Curated annotation (Swiss-Prot):
It comes from the Eukaryota. Belongs to the glycosyl hydrolase 14 family. InterPro entries: Glyco_hydro_14, Glyco_hydro_14_CS, Glyco_hydro_14B_pln, Glycoside_hydrolase_SF. GO terms for biological process: polysaccharide catabolic process. Changing E378Q: Loss of activity. Monomer. One of its GO terms (molecular function) is beta-amylase activity. Keywords: Acetylation, Carbohydrate metabolism, Glycosidase, Hydrolase, Polysaccharide degradation. Disulfide bonds: none annotated. Changing D99 to N/E: Loss of activity. It holds the Pfam family Glyco_hydro_14. PANTHER family: BETA-AMYLASE 1, CHLOROPLASTIC (PTHR31352), BETA-AMYLASE 6 (PTHR31352:SF40). This is Beta-amylase. It comes from Glycine max.
Length: 493
């Protein structure tokens, strides 16, 4: 049982509290965090995840980085016997679910935004979302001579060099490369800041002047210079059948609508690819893996228009796989797909949301495995209950434990949202400890990940670029891998 069981081990990470380093670049409560981290260590947790906030670190001005508070944080994590998942967080904290602290992007960038409002994702009404720089400015040299991708590149390089000792020592297991709002490769199509409420369809975020011009040039090249961006897609809180765009036989299935949706979703593929190229250059030779985050847009998954996925930039339909192209893009970077809505069951969602989180998880994970990449995940919402943990464990090993060897299917890791005093209360923490144990296939905590075939080797160069047509060959629908109806390693087991 034991070593066969150890090859079934799926590591568990815990997100740190938001604002552990505050907006003033102060590590405010090391002593309190220490006590919490030592509890996690004794509970068997493998490591922790933290946002390395751009708006904290590069606040003073371009290339004026202050890494000192984060060095103190990393030092503490190391002392407490935990590894670290470091998010390169190029986004704002404050306007998404659960955000309890306010960390804008650097003021010097916002200053440029006051003169050029088109550096922000923009909806049809003209509202500027300041949480992330539009993909439109990725390669526009408008930030005191740098492009947005150069900013991100320079930041990652500075992190790699200034944290070189922690990297060499093996503290950092993965670099989560932030690619949009909430760190995710997506558009801000469901902004609470503009009055969105679940389960609204959301809105397309491509009306900044850079994206609009790019679209207009592309439709002209396609022989349709008169095509305009969608004007019949409704508003954030609509339902799909209320809109010309998403109704049955609506604009989304027309040649115009299909072209738009392809263009819009391709912008994210290319944004992720180009930024991961820079991440690979920055961390070349380091014993880390790269990861990206994919949001779980489960509402409207069960209707043919998938409207909320579409407005988020995931062009996923019943007959078009919008996620497997992302997995294929990751393959050349040897990168992890971290899918950030892992814990849900369909029965938890209201019927009117047409919500399919179980099936969405199965689709995304299956696509990653079909494309021979590693797949990780997170719970979306705070959960302390056995139903949630058993669903996570199911997704972690969807065909169960292999008593005879490694499992044919397993996730590469799960990161739990989030460390809080509530997690550490007696009953909640007791159930969490059982979750960890079952994720670990009933084995004790295993400090050396080589033992469970998660050795960390130096980051190699990315493989050659994959052209967009080859990436989009992965839109071909495929059957998912079969899932058990329940895990064989329940917490109450
Ligand atoms: O980008 C943030 C977060 O958005 C989604 O979370 C949803 C959640 O699934 C809904 O049930 C509801 O609570 O609204 C949340 C958004 O405010 C994604 O599911 C998640 O993956 C992503 O991190
Ligand atoms: O600290 C990580 C990340 O947390 C929040 O975003 C979450 C979202 O709340 C979830 O639903 C989840 O599992 O995925 C997102 C990505 O981890 C903050 O909103 C975000 O700013 C922060 O980076």
């Amino acid at each position: 049982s034991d070593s066969n069981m150890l090859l079934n081990y799926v590591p568990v990470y815990v997100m740190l509290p938001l604002g552990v380093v505050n907006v003033d670049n102060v590590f405010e409560d090391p002593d309190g965090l220490k006590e919490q981290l030592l509890q996690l260590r004794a509970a068997g947790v493998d490591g922790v995840m933290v946002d390395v906030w751009w708006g904290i670190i590069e606040l003073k001005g371009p290339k004026q980085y202050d890494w000192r508070a984060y060095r103190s944080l990393l030092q503490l994590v190391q002392e407490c016997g935990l590894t670290l998942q470091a998010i390169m967080s190029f986004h704002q904290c404050g306007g998404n679910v659960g955000d309890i602290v306010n960390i804008p992007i650097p003021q010097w960038v916002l200053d440029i935004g006051e003169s050029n409002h088109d550096i922000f994702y923009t909806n049809r009404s003209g509202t500027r979302n300041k949480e992330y720089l539009t993909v439109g400015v990725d390669n526009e040299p408008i930030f005191h001579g740098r492009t947005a991708i150069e900013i991100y590149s320079d930041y990652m390089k500075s992190f790699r060099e200034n944290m070189s000792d922690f990297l060499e020592s093996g503290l950092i297991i993965d670099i989560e490369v932030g690619l949009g709002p909430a760190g995710e490769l997506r558009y801000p199509s469901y902004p609470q800041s503009q009055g969105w409420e679940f389960p609204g369809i959301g809105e397309f975020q491509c009306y900044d002047k850079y994206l609009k011009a790019d679209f207009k040039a592309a439709v002209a090249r396609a022989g349709h210079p008169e095509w305009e961006l969608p004007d019949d897609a409704g508003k954030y809180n609509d339902v799909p059948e209320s809109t010309g765009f998403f109704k049955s036989n609506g604009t989304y299935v027309t040649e115009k609508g299909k072209f738009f949706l392809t263009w819009y979703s391709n912008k994210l593929l290319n944004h992720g690819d180009q930024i991961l190229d820079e991440a690979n250059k920055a961390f070349l030779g380091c014993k880390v893996k790269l990861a990206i985050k994919v949001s779980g847009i489960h509402w409207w998954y069960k209707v043919e228009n998938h409207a909320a996925e579409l407005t988020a930039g995931y062009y996923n339909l019943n007959d078009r796989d919008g996620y497997r192209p992302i997995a294929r893009m990751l393959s050349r970077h040897h990168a992890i797909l971290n899918f950030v809505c892992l814990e849900m069951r369909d029965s938890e969602q209201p019927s009117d949301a047409k919500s399919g989180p179980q099936e969405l998880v199965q689709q995304v994970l299956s696509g990653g495995w079909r494309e021979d990449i590693r797949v990780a995940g997170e719970n979306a919402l705070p959960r302390y209950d056995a139903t949630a943990y058993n669903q996570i464990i199911l997704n972690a090993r969807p065909q169960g434990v292999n008593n005879n060897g490694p499992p044919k299917l397993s996730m590469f890791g799960v990161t739990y949202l989030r460390l809080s005093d509530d997690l550490l209360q007696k009953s909640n923490f007791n159930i969490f400890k059982k979750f960890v144990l079952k994720m670990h296939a009933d084995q004790d905590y295993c400090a050396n990940p080589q033992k469970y075939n998660h050795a960390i080797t130096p980051l190699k160069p990315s493989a050659p670029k994959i052209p967009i047509e080859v990436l989009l060959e992965a839109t071909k629908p495929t059957l998912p891998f079969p899932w058990l109806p329940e895990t064989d390693m329940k917490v109450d087991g």
